[PDB]
């Protein structure tokens, strides 16, 4: 999971 | 002929419409952004997922921000009089209000505004559809245990995020939205109005997704869209 | 029993909820913010509607921004468990991100805020509504010829204009946006679901309205509303 | 008619  | 109703978009124009793509998953290194691992898994399934709806898909991958305005531009410039949308996906990182191009930032509502009523004449009164995969600030979700018409009318913001948070996007299965959306269109798109599918999306989003960090601040944060409608009708993407 | 489905909003609780209408008419001298004619028409319009939805209706006018986060704050703190869900109108003076009390503006995040997943947990997984007739700016539309749930979850924002612009409002009829609303939910609280409601607002809003004014900057004006949903529910307001 |  990464943030955008 | 009988009684008529004139609730819903007329969506038996010859074409669908467009379905621009952009995915942007590597940035100059000047700017300091990082590569969107899992973004072309997301631009391949907004790709088979829209061609089953029957728009025309164009994908254009990894656009400067003076190649994302001139493409916008050039697209808003096409007669769209046989079309009956228009469908713009952006995956990039992002702030409120911004996406951001190879090289640096495009305001949205620049890209947006080339298709306004009164600037894009073959598309008033059609749904103009804008579904945005990039983060809009830096806000983590901790979650709960449990003059004839506007010119700004007949847009639809599909946000993957609420005003002000992060977005997250797995690096093996795409981004928690984009998916989930590609998910929901495909099981309804001939059953549900566009507002009801989407409302689908914003449940499994926020129901099926977790993050996982080694890394506190980042672990166990949830994700809400965000749906921003000046729609002035029910949008089927079937017809009789 | 037999197969069941899940899709919307359980609205058989006891008590339908609370409809909070915050009705700022006359402002503090000191502010220089005119007062809002017609604004009375709105508020009197919304206690009816909302009555026969069987909504418990408070009205409150002319609040300071510290009476309202009180309020607010106050409301948030009540026990919700037997009520289906939540309204707030605020009738005011605004910009984007704000609503003015008699004295001063409120971050409409801090009102809001008070309702989130984690911080009112009676209201968790119910539909929080947030109704604004206020302006988001100053851009006026020419118009064209023709961790389990996120914390923000569950929240609507029925805006009467787009982002940045002011909205309008009529000194004798009451507001564009109000005034559509009410009709609308008239005619089809118990018929259509609420996105559905607020789409025909949309048109409504954007069709049978244009301001007309002695001075040209402000004549001939359109307005198309703002659906913001992070609902996760289709949400009707009748069951079975 | 007017904006608030
Ligand atoms: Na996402
Ligand atoms: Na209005």
Chains 1, 4 share one sequence.
Not at chain 2, 11 to 29: A, R, S, T, V, W
Not at chain 2, 55 to 74: F, H, Q, S
Not at chain 2, 96 to 114: A, M
Request: proline residues 2%; contains cysteine; charged residues 25%.
């Amino acid at each position: 999971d990464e943030v955008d | 002929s009988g009684i008529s109703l004139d609730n819903s978009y007329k969506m038996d124009y010859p074409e669908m419409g467009l379905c621009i793509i952009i995915n942007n998953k590597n940035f100059h290194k000047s700017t300091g952004m990082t590569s969107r691992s899992g973004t072309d898994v997301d631009a391949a399934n907004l790709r088979e997922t829209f061609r089953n709806l029957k728009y025309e898909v164009r994908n254009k991958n990894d656009l400067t921000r003076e190649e994302i305005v001139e493409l916008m531009r050039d697209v808003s410039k096409e007669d769209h009089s046989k079309r009956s949308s228009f469908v713009c996906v952006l995956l990039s990182h992002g702030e409120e209000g911004i996406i951001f191009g190879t090289n640096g930032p495009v305001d949205l509502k620049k890209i947006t505004n080339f298709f306004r009523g009164d600037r894009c004449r073959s598309l008033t009164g059609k749904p103009k559809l804008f579904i945005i995969q990039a983060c809009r600030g830096t806000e983590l979700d901790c979650g709960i245990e449990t003059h004839k018409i506007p010119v700004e009318a007949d847009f639809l913001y599909a946000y993957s995020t609420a005003p002000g948070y992060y977005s997250w996007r797995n690096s093996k299965d795409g981004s928690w939205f984009i998916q989930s959306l590609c998910a929901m269109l495909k099981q309804y798109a001939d059953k549900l109005e566009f507002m009801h599918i989407l409302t689908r999306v914003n449940r499994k989003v926020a129901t099926e997704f977790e993050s996982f960090s080694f890394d506190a601040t980042f672990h166990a944060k949830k994700q809400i869209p965000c749906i921003s409608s000046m729609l002035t009708k029910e949008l089927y993407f079937y017809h009789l």
